[PDB]
Write a protein that binds this ligand. Structure first.
Ligand SMILES: NC(=O)C1=CN([C@@H]2O[C@H](COP(=O)(O)OP(=O)(O)OC[C@H]3O[C@@H](n4cnc5c(N)ncnc54)[C@H](OP(=O)(O)O)[C@@H]3O)[C@@H](O)[C@H]2O)C=CC1
Length: 291
C-alpha cells in the first residue's frame, strides 16, 4: 500500500516519515526533507484543509494509507481531509493526528481540554464517514518533560507534586517504527493502539535519577506543586499553557496509567509485536550526552 504522510517535516512526522521509508513502504510526503528525498520519498504539493486538492492527490497517486501528523494548533484542518477521503472511497486506513493520550479517557484542564475537544471532533467525523482508522495513543516522547515546552536540566530538577506518578516514555524512533507497523495490521483496524512499554514506565523522580547517572553527579530537587501547574494553565497562553495542562494531567492526575486496556477496542504495542524491544530511557538519555 502507498502511504501519504501529512506533516512529515514536523516533530513527530519526521520520525513517522523516516520509519515508513526504512520499512520499504512507498511513501509520499505532502509539502506546503532532503534526507527524506535521498531515502526515497516522493513529494506532492498541497494542504490538508483544501478538500478538492486532496481528493485529486489521493486519486492520482492511488493512496491506500494516510497518516496525519499536523500540530496541536491545526487539528481542525483535518476536517476537509476526512471529507476528501470519504469522497474518493479507496482509503484502507487513516491515522489522524493523535500521538499522545487517549483523548476519550483523559480529562485535562483548559486549555489542554480544548485540544482534546478538537481531536474528539475529528474522531467522530472519521467514524461517521466510515473511514477505517487507527488511533496512535503513544503517551510521552522520551525527553525531559518540561512543563511549558532542549535537554534535561544541569542546575536543579523541578519535580511535579510528589514526583511519584508513573508515565510511559517512548523514543521518537519507536513512535515512528511501531506506528508504521500498525497501518495494515488486521489487529489494529478501527482500534486505539496504546504504547505501554513496561521498562519505560517511570515517575519524575526515576527520570531525574536516570539523568543523574548520565551526568555523573546530583542536582538539588525542588517541588512544583499542582497549584503552580494549574496557575500556568490558567494563563491561557498558547501553546505553553496547553503543555502545563497536559503536565498536570500526566504527573498529578496519573492519566497515562489509570485505565485498563483490556476491552475489545483497545490493543497495546508490546503485546501486538512481542520480542520486539523498545529503546530504554537510559538509552535515549545516553544520546543527549553526545553533544
Ligand atoms: N506524545 C508527545 O510527547 C507529543 C505529541 N504531540 C502530538 O503530535 C501531533 C504532531 O504535532 P507536532 O510534531 O508538534 O507537530 P509540528 O507543529 O512539529 O508539525 C506539524 C506539521 O504539520 C504540517 N501542517 C500543518 N498544517 C498543515 C496543513 N493544513 N496541511 C499540510 N500540512 C500541515 C506542518 O507543516 P508546516 O511547517 O509547512 O506548517 C508541520 O510539518 C499533535 O497531534 C500533537 O498533539 C506532539 C508533540 C509531543
Amino acid at each position: 500500500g502507498r502511504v501519504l504522510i501529512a506533516g512529515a517535516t514536523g516533530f513527530i512526522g519526521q520520525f513517522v516519515a523516516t520509519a515508513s521509508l526504512d520499512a520499504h513502504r512507498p511513501t509520499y510526503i505532502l509539502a506546503r526533507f532532503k534526507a527524506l528525498e535521498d531515502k526515497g520519498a516522493i513529494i506532492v504539493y498541497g494542504l490538508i484543509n483544501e478538500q478538492e486538492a486532496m481528493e485529486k492527490i489521493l486519486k492520482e497517486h492511488e493512496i491506500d494509507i494516510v497518516v496525519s501528523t499536523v500540530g496541536g494548533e491545526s487539528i481542525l484542518d483535518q476536517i476537509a481531509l476526512v471529507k476528501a477521503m470519504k469522497a474518493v472511497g479507496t482509503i484502507k486506513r487513516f491515522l489522524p493526528s493523535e500521538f499522545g493520550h487517549d483523548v476519550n479517557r483523559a480529562d485535562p484542564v483548559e486549555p489542554g481540554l480544548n485540544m482534546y475537544r478538537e481531536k474528539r471532533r475529528v474522531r467522530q467525523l472519521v467514524e461517521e464517514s466510515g473511514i477505517p482508522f487507527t488511533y496512535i495513543c503513544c503517551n510521552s516522547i522520551a525527553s525531559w518533560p518540561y512543563y511549558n515546552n532542549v535537554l534535561p536540566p544541569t542546575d536543579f530538577f523541578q519535580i511535579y507534586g510528589d514526583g511519584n506518578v508513573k508515565a510511559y516514555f517512548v523514543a521518537g524512533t519507536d513512535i515512528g517504527k511501531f506506528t508504521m507497523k500498525t497501518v495494515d495490521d488486521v489487529r489494529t483496524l478501527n482500534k486505539s493502539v496504546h504504547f505501554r512499554p513496561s521498562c519505560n514506565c517511570l515517575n519524575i523522580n526515576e527520570l531525574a535519577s536516570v539523568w543523574e547517572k548520565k551526568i555523573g553527579r546530583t542536582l538539588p530537587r525542588v517541588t512544583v506543586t499542582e497549584d503552580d501547574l494549574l496557575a500556568a494553565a490558567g494563563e491561557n497562553i498558547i501553546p505553553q499553557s496547553v503543555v502545563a495542562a497536559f503536565t498536570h494531567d500526566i504527573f498529578i492526575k496519573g492519566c497515562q496509567v489509570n485505565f485498563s486496556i483490556d476491552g475489545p477496542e483497545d490493543v497495546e504495542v508490546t503485546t501486538l509485536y512481542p520480542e520486539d524491544s523498545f529503546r530504554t530511557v537510559e538509552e535515549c538519555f545516553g544520546e543527549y550526552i553526545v553533544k
